[PDB]
Amino acid sequence: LKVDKEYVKALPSQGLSSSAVLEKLKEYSSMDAFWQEGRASGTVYSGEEKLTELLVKAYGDFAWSNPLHPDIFPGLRKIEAEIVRIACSLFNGGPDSCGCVTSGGTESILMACKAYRDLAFEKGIKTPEIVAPQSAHAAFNKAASYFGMKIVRVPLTKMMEVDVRAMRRAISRNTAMLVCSTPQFPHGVIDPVPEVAKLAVKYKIPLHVDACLGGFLIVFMEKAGYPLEHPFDFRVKGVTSISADTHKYGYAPKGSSLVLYSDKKYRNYQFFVDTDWQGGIYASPTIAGSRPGGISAACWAALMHFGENGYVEATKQIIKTARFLKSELENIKGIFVFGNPQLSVIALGSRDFDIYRLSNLMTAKGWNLNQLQFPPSIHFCITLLHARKRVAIQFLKDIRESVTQIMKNPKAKTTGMGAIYGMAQTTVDRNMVAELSSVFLDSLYSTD
Amino acid sequence: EYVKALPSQGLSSSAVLEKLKEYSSMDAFWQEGRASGTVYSGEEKLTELLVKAYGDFAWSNPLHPDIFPGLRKIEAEIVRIACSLFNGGPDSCGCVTSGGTESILMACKAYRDLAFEKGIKTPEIVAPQSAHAAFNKAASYFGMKIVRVPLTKMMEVDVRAMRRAISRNTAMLVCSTPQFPHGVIDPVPEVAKLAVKYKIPLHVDACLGGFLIVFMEKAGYPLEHPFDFRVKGVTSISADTHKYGYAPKGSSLVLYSDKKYRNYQFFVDTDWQGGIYASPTIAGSRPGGISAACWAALMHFGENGYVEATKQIIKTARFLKSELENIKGIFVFGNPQLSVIALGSRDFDIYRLSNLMTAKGWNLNQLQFPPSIHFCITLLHARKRVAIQFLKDIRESVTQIMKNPKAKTTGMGAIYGMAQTTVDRNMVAELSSVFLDSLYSTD
């Protein structure tokens, strides 16, 4: 926002040399130095030098590959097939399971939603509904908005799990899919997949499991020695699709994710086919046409580099860190932890002061946390980066000091960003907030 | 042969890279210049630069502008540069997207929501028959009706037919600069007349042509029609940096004449427990590496670079066009002024020519409705100097075929012809599903 350099607003009359381009780029990259010292929530999952170098070289070897042309790039076609099958194995899908590589968790979610809309249409459902917990990702609303589907969000329990009784009452003759999250992003709580799947089986409704965030942790937890309370994978009868982000705890480059299905019969509905196009018979498996095959190469590289032993070890370290932080953060007067988080995310509240004061303060001390709402809350997401750099001690100390400071003045009005997130929740005119967002989006592209 | 599960033990870097060389052992085909379109430069030094640029921004993600303010600036700049190239002026604006499909999808979604705002229940896209398949995806995904209007003998949209296709439900008009099948530019001024008269948004699909058409005049090859924001009624443009921008795959632009239109493409969830959610495009997390590399390509070529590149492509196109017009047995559809040349034949089955060119080691694009094949000339093709060889092989292929013009088409060539003549569209749809299934096979 406050840039210290003029904007390039047109193409240069004379193209720059390679060295000059890369030297000018240094000015932009030096601006982006907030994550390297382990002070950002989520965002960068490993960021390690030797890993980066491998992933960029792998990308580089496949820079011009485009899986739209599998006759030209059969090697890339085999890499993507292998990525999918590795994932189906990790989720114990067996030989009938299938999937596709996508650009991210959002596309993974949208693809399943679209698949289930088209199946519902085929069964005479005029306006399909998504039935989802309040905590399910925003991408489910985007799918509703994009694909013309009604979305019903059901309330959560005191422990921030979906209320299954309420979910039952939300089901109707028009329900196209059920959703649960492993875990939900806000508070890092795993929904009770078996209980939701019971409904899915009883009412004959597809069930999508959102494992975008947890996928490349939860798959390894048992082997890491941290067993979970609930099963989450294709072994659970009624689970019809899973989303999972390689680009989160797979340590794959950005622009990589999977949508997996229990059966090809489901995946078929996600496909787009135009048999009549002048430009040839056109069939795409996902949203994009042209895609960056380099990213798929690098994603395959991450997986083959970590292996089972690497992801188990990475999981062990993230979970050790999170369990330590969670037990400490439970013994601080003035805050509480929402629910009982078993993975990498911890959400905090305060019954004693405005919790956004803590996000404001920690921002000041060089930390970047996520700011939630409904109810008022903040979270941090623990990554390999955070375990590697051992920021856990300093995080705690800054949390403790901040809380003591706030506590000296518990009713002192809340300022800056914290104020906006507070007031936004109380504003009865939702369009005010919407209009505030559109200004923020515009401001992203500003060159003034 | 197939890796079907995670290795128990991770491979070392070197071992990973050594294994990956197995997958990259077919690139000589494209590298030799034998592939239609597909790779637009491929040039070694350019690749090194773009991969380094990507590498500097590998972990950047524009969902987090506060963390990566450098990427943010980069993307604002790519959009402003592109707006200048299309002479949009200060009120024009745009977004970086993942490719041309997403650019088309975004504009369609923008126009749908604006039509919803005016009480229209099922918004209609009015498009030429030649418009890209992505417009049918848009319709399918977003619940819009697509009306495809016929072409003239020159393969341009029939503008009278297009007017007759307009209804109270029309949300957008489309034309292409050029359309992908025949490489013909639609008469943008004439379509913009309708847009203005009936107050309908108009989207210009410049995904393919974008980073040629903007330089044509300066290359010394003035086009017949104007195409950019200076044309009254053009409300948006899609343009692929990953084609004639020579940018990495994963890179395209959607540009608007005014901010008011772009506001309709955005997604906002103010109520999400995870926080106020506002995304400009389809994706959430995105690869900022690709944007960095897209900026690098723009800054590396500059105006002089792209003018010179455009010169080299069009010289090659105009030569091949004049030569393919002087070959007994074949004709070229319409009058292509850019990088795509489409061939047909009234003397034999055109797919035989694709058969023989495939055997000679060339990969051309097979079209349909009507039976046709095309080549897309890229900067790679010009650097490799393949045009003469290309011509020689076409001539020999035609000469041969013309000895038995009425012989039965075999191979894929037959599939392409049968496909169009089948009465049950379904059977064709199923072959496609089966093809797509096969992409993901590990058997």
Author numbering:
A (entry chain B): 106 to 553
B (entry chain A): 111 to 553
The authors write:
To confirm the soundness of our virtual screening campaign, we solved the crystal structures of unbound hSPL and AfuSPL at 1.8 Å and 3.5 Å resolution, respectively. The structure of ligand-free hSPL was superposable with the one solved in complex with a known active site inhibitor with a RMSD of 0.36 Å (between 443 Cα pairs), suggesting that hSPL does not undergo extensive conformational changes upon ligand binding. Access to the active site is guaranteed by a deep cleft flanked by the last two C-terminal helices. The surface of this cleft is highly hydrophobic to accommodate the aliphatic tail of S1P. Therefore, the rigidity of the hSPL structure may account for the need to prevent a hydrophobic collapse that would close the substrate binding site. PLP is bound through a Schiff base linkage with a lysine residue that in the human enzyme complexed with a known inhibitor is Lys359 (internal aldimine). In the visible region, hSPL shows an absorbance maximum centered at 426 nm and a shoulder at about 340 nm, attributable to the ketoenamine and enolimine tautomers of the internal aldimine, respectively. In agreement with SPL being a well conserved protein from bacteria to humans, we found that hSPL and AfuSPL show very similar biochemical properties, although we could notice differences related to (i) an higher propensity of the fungal enzyme to bind the hydrophobic probe ANS, which may also correlate with the higher aggregation tendency and reduced purification yields, and (ii) some changes in the spectral and kinetic features, probably due to subtle differences in the region surrounding the active site. In this regard, the crystal structures of the two proteins in the ligand-free form confirm that the coenzyme binding regions are superimposable, thus further supporting the possibility to develop a dual-species inhibitor. Indeed, when C17 was docked in the catalytic pocket of both hSPL and AfuSPL, the best predicted poses were in the entrance of the narrow and hydrophobic channel. In both enzymes, one of the aromatic thienyl rings of C17 stabilizes the binding by π-stacking with Phe545(A) and Phe565(A) of hSPL and AfuSPL, respectively.
